Design an enzyme around this catalytic site. Structure first.
Site, PDB file in Angstrom:
ATOM      1  N   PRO A  43       0.780  -1.234   0.000  1.00 51.15           N
ATOM      2  CA  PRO A  43       0.000   0.000   0.000  1.00 51.15           C
ATOM      3  C   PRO A  43       0.820   1.297   0.000  1.00 51.15           C
ATOM      4  CG  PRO A  43      -0.209  -1.200   2.085  1.00 51.15           C
ATOM      5  CD  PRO A  43       0.370  -2.139   1.083  1.00 51.15           C
ATOM      6  N   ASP A  44       0.221   2.339  -0.567  1.00 48.68           N
ATOM      7  CA  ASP A  44       0.735   3.689  -0.493  1.00 48.68           C
ATOM      8  C   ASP A  44      -0.079   4.398   0.573  1.00 48.68           C
ATOM      9  OD1 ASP A  44      -1.712   4.395  -1.506  1.00 48.68           O
ATOM     10  OD2 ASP A  44      -0.945   5.064  -3.496  1.00 48.68           O
ATOM     11  N   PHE A  45       0.082   5.718   0.672  1.00 52.92           N
ATOM     12  CA  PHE A  45      -0.576   6.508   1.691  1.00 52.92           C
ATOM     13  C   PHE A  45      -1.795   7.192   1.095  1.00 52.92           C
ATOM     14  CE2 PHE A  45       3.105   7.536   4.924  1.00 52.92           C
ATOM     15  CZ  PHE A  45       3.165   6.201   5.273  1.00 52.92           C
ATOM     16  N   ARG A  46      -1.594   7.964   0.022  1.00 53.53           N
ATOM     17  CA  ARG A  46      -2.629   8.898  -0.397  1.00 53.53           C
ATOM     18  C   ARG A  46      -3.716   8.168  -1.204  1.00 53.53           C
ATOM     19  N   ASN A 108      10.988   4.975  -1.266  1.00 54.46           N
ATOM     20  CA  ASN A 108      10.459   3.702  -0.827  1.00 54.46           C
ATOM     21  C   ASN A 108      11.490   2.980  -0.003  1.00 54.46           C
ATOM     22  OD1 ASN A 108       8.127   4.144  -2.164  1.00 54.46           O
ATOM     23  ND2 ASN A 108       8.709   2.925  -3.972  1.00 54.46           N
ATOM     24  N   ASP A 110      10.964  -0.412   0.687  1.00 54.11           N
ATOM     25  CA  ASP A 110      10.618  -1.816   0.530  1.00 54.11           C
ATOM     26  C   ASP A 110      11.795  -2.644  -0.007  1.00 54.11           C
ATOM     27  OD1 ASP A 110      10.423  -1.184  -2.306  1.00 54.11           O
ATOM     28  OD2 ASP A 110       8.264  -0.863  -2.096  1.00 54.11           O
ATOM     29  N   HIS A 127      14.711   7.830   1.924  1.00 50.78           N
ATOM     30  CA  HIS A 127      13.961   7.593   3.147  1.00 50.78           C
ATOM     31  C   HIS A 127      14.472   6.343   3.864  1.00 50.78           C
ATOM     32  CE1 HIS A 127      10.423  10.422   1.908  1.00 50.78           C
ATOM     33  NE2 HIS A 127      11.523  11.055   2.258  1.00 50.78           N
TER      34      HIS A 127
HETATM   35  N1  LIG Z   1       6.389   1.330  -0.640  1.00 49.87           N
HETATM   36  C1  LIG Z   1       6.882   2.142   0.283  1.00 49.87           C
HETATM   37  O1  LIG Z   1       8.093   2.152   0.550  1.00 49.87           O
HETATM   38  C2  LIG Z   1       5.973   3.151   0.914  1.00 49.87           C
HETATM   39  C3  LIG Z   1       4.622   2.904   1.077  1.00 49.87           C
HETATM   40  C4  LIG Z   1       3.817   3.852   1.679  1.00 49.87           C
HETATM   41  C5  LIG Z   1       4.365   5.031   2.132  1.00 49.87           C
HETATM   42  N2  LIG Z   1       5.709   5.273   1.995  1.00 49.87           N
HETATM   43  C6  LIG Z   1       6.290   6.551   2.474  1.00 49.87           C
HETATM   44  O2  LIG Z   1       5.239   7.490   2.644  1.00 49.87           O
HETATM   45  C7  LIG Z   1       5.474   8.682   1.875  1.00 49.87           C
HETATM   46  C8  LIG Z   1       4.477   8.741   0.751  1.00 49.87           C
HETATM   47  O3  LIG Z   1       5.159   9.186  -0.451  1.00 49.87           O
HETATM   48  P1  LIG Z   1       4.612   8.852  -1.911  1.00 49.87           P
HETATM   49  O4  LIG Z   1       4.319  10.122  -2.622  1.00 49.87           O
HETATM   50  O5  LIG Z   1       5.445   7.777  -2.501  1.00 49.87           O
HETATM   51  O6  LIG Z   1       3.254   8.092  -1.638  1.00 49.87           O
HETATM   52  P2  LIG Z   1       1.836   8.766  -1.563  1.00 49.87           P
HETATM   53  O7  LIG Z   1       0.832   7.753  -1.122  1.00 49.87           O
HETATM   54  O8  LIG Z   1       2.016   9.993  -0.732  1.00 49.87           O
HETATM   55  O9  LIG Z   1       1.633   9.130  -3.122  1.00 49.87           O
HETATM   56  C9  LIG Z   1       1.656   8.055  -4.099  1.00 49.87           C
HETATM   57  C10 LIG Z   1       1.269   8.562  -5.470  1.00 49.87           C
HETATM   58  O10 LIG Z   1       1.290   7.471  -6.436  1.00 49.87           O
HETATM   59  C11 LIG Z   1       0.038   7.345  -7.090  1.00 49.87           C
HETATM   60  N3  LIG Z   1      -0.148   5.922  -7.354  1.00 49.87           N
HETATM   61  C12 LIG Z   1      -0.348   4.886  -6.472  1.00 49.87           C
HETATM   62  N4  LIG Z   1      -0.315   3.696  -7.032  1.00 49.87           N
HETATM   63  C13 LIG Z   1      -0.040   3.967  -8.370  1.00 49.87           C
HETATM   64  C14 LIG Z   1       0.137   3.148  -9.505  1.00 49.87           C
HETATM   65  N5  LIG Z   1       0.077   1.820  -9.487  1.00 49.87           N
HETATM   66  N6  LIG Z   1       0.395   3.748 -10.688  1.00 49.87           N
HETATM   67  C15 LIG Z   1       0.495   5.080 -10.721  1.00 49.87           C
HETATM   68  N7  LIG Z   1       0.353   5.946  -9.728  1.00 49.87           N
HETATM   69  C16 LIG Z   1       0.091   5.327  -8.567  1.00 49.87           C
HETATM   70  C17 LIG Z   1      -0.969   8.025  -6.180  1.00 49.87           C
HETATM   71  O11 LIG Z   1      -2.029   8.530  -6.953  1.00 49.87           O
HETATM   72  C18 LIG Z   1      -0.132   9.170  -5.605  1.00 49.87           C
HETATM   73  O12 LIG Z   1      -0.033  10.238  -6.529  1.00 49.87           O
HETATM   74  C19 LIG Z   1       6.951   8.630   1.448  1.00 49.87           C
HETATM   75  O13 LIG Z   1       7.836   9.341   2.299  1.00 49.87           O
HETATM   76  C20 LIG Z   1       7.306   7.142   1.486  1.00 49.87           C
HETATM   77  O14 LIG Z   1       8.646   6.979   1.928  1.00 49.87           O
HETATM   78  C21 LIG Z   1       6.525   4.320   1.423  1.00 49.87           C
HETATM   79  C1  LIG Z   2       8.874   7.942   5.256  1.00 50.48           C
HETATM   80  O1  LIG Z   2       7.965   8.209   4.437  1.00 50.48           O
HETATM   81  C2  LIG Z   2       8.883   6.546   5.853  1.00 50.48           C
HETATM   82  C3  LIG Z   2       7.574   5.825   5.701  1.00 50.48           C
HETATM   83  C4  LIG Z   2       7.443   4.616   6.610  1.00 50.48           C
HETATM   84  C5  LIG Z   2       7.248   3.307   5.879  1.00 50.48           C
HETATM   85  C6  LIG Z   2       5.842   3.062   5.390  1.00 50.48           C
HETATM   86  C7  LIG Z   2       5.363   1.641   5.578  1.00 50.48           C
HETATM   87  C8  LIG Z   2       5.848   0.670   4.516  1.00 50.48           C
HETATM   88  C9  LIG Z   2       6.162  -0.735   5.024  1.00 50.48           C
HETATM   89  C10 LIG Z   2       5.951  -1.854   3.999  1.00 50.48           C
HETATM   90  C11 LIG Z   2       6.168  -3.272   4.524  1.00 50.48           C
HETATM   91  C12 LIG Z   2       7.608  -3.651   4.807  1.00 50.48           C
HETATM   92  C13 LIG Z   2       8.555  -3.416   3.658  1.00 50.48           C
HETATM   93  C14 LIG Z   2       9.850  -4.186   3.723  1.00 50.48           C
END
Ligand SMILES: NC(=O)c1ccc[n+]([C@@H]2O[C@H](COP(=O)([O-])OP(=O)(O)OC[C@H]3O[C@@H](n4cnc5c(N)ncnc54)[C@H](O)[C@@H]3O)[C@@H](O)[C@H]2O)c1
Ligand SMILES: *C(=O)CCCCCCCCCCCCC
Ligand SMILES: [Zn+2]
Lengths: 292, 7
Positions: A43-46, A108, A110, A127
């Site tokens: 999952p993402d956040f927004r 990311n 991950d 990050h």
């Molecule tokens: N995978 C991870 O490592 C992870 C996951 C969640 C949050 N975070 C952290 O939280 C913060 C959020 O930053 P962010 O901007 O990456 O995430 P966000 O959730 O803030 O924004 C993600 C963006 O990607 C778009 N999106 C999502 N899935 C998509 C897809 N399959 N194809 C195209 N667009 C897609 C969304 O519309 C949005 O614009 C960061 O600091 C990050 O480090 C990291």
């Molecule tokens: C800054 O944005 C740090 C965000 C914190 C991590 C978000 C959670 C993602 C964890 C995914 C599962 C484990 C991945 C190895």
């Protein structure tokens, strides 16, 4: 130069692919976020349906400082069964293998970019990452890999250092914490010499990482592959520094592809005559992961 | 050199 001048023959995917074919285009930077891992089941956040939907504070550092048990629980929940990089990770790999990638800067944690075969050198994990973990005790800072950390996060025991029994924290940057030094150093050098900024799966809300786009030279094309336009100057904050302009009559170098990054990159790959190479890599590397 | 934050 700060002279704004148009290098793309037109503001489209094909324009960028042509630009990429040109000699002017030698050094590419990617900026990526959760969007490029969403399809690897992280999952993402927004995103409306998954993200910040029982426990924003579970990644502020002070909350982790006071109470770290909530975080380690979340990470058991989101911790995937299998780590397959996405088509969009593998696209980045192709850039490396054709010597086009100057750097991938990534929010990311991950570790997928490494699994796709980007190397430490290729990568600014601005990050941090789950790849490595350390004791929090200054006098110790003993280092741990992702196997030790998983055993703990899945055992449901709060990870404690075997030498001194301090909390053992994954090398991520929490909200509040400062980014790594390497990020600023790579930023100083990299953005002098970039020919193309390739922006994938990020809302560009998290600073200082968002501001990277304004550190590009003003005639560096910028392609955004994303579900939503992102990076446009806000009508209100601008009122009071080099933001995305895709649509205005002054638009000259920014291009937006709106969709999944797997399709977007798959499209771009195709224009470049890379689709077979991409299809084979992804199919070949996943198979290999499946046989591990 | 700021620290990670939302915006
Ligand atoms: N995978 C991870 O490592 C992870 C996951 C969640 C949050 N975070 C952290 O939280 C913060 C959020 O930053 P962010 O901007 O990456 O995430 P966000 O959730 O803030 O924004 C993600 C963006 O990607 C778009 N999106 C999502 N899935 C998509 C897809 N399959 N194809 C195209 N667009 C897609 C969304 O519309 C949005 O614009 C960061 O600091 C990050 O480090 C990291
Ligand atoms: C800054 O944005 C740090 C965000 C914190 C991590 C978000 C959670 C993602 C964890 C995914 C599962 C484990 C991945 C190895
Ligand atoms: Zn220790």
């Amino acid at each position: 130069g700060s002279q704004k001048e148009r290098l793309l023959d037109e503001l489209t995917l094909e324009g960028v692919a042509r630009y990429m074919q040109s000699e002017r285009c030698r050094r590419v930077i990617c900026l990526v976020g959760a969007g490029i891992s969403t399809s690897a089941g992280i999952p993402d956040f927004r995103s409306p349906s998954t993200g910040l939907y029982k426990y924003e504070a579970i990644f502020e550092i002070s909350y982790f400082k006071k109470h770290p048990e909530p975080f380690f629980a979340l990470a058991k929940e989101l911790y995937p069964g299998q780590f397959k990089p996405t088509i969009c990770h593998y696209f980045m790999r192709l850039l490396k293998d054709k010597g086009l990638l100057l750097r991938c800067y990534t929010q990311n944690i991950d570790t997928l970019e490494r699994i796709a075969g980007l190397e430490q050198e290729d990568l600014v994990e601005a990050h941090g990452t789950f790849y490595t973990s350390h004791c929090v005790s200054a006098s110790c800072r003993h280092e741990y890999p992702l196997s030790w950390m998983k055993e703990k996060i899945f055992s449901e025991v709060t990870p404690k250092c075997e030498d001194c029994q301090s909390l053992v924290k994954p090398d991520i940057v929490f909200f509040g914490e400062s980014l790594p030094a390497r990020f600023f150093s790579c930023m100083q050098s990299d953005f002098l010499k970039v020919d193309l900024l390739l922006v994938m799966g990020t809302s560009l809300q998290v600073q200082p990482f968002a501001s990277l786009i304004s550190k590009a030279p003003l005639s560096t094309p910028r392609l955004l592959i994303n579900k939503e336009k992102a990076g446009q100057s806000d009508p209100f904050l601008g009122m009071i520094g080099g933001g995305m302009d895709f649509d205005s009559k002054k638009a000259y170098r920014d291009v937006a592809w709106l969709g999944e990054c797997d399709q977007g990159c798959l499209a771009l790959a195709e224009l470049l005559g890379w689709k077979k190479e991409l299809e084979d890599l992804v199919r070949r590397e996943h198979a290999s992961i499946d046989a591990q | 050199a700021p620290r990670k934050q939302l915006a």
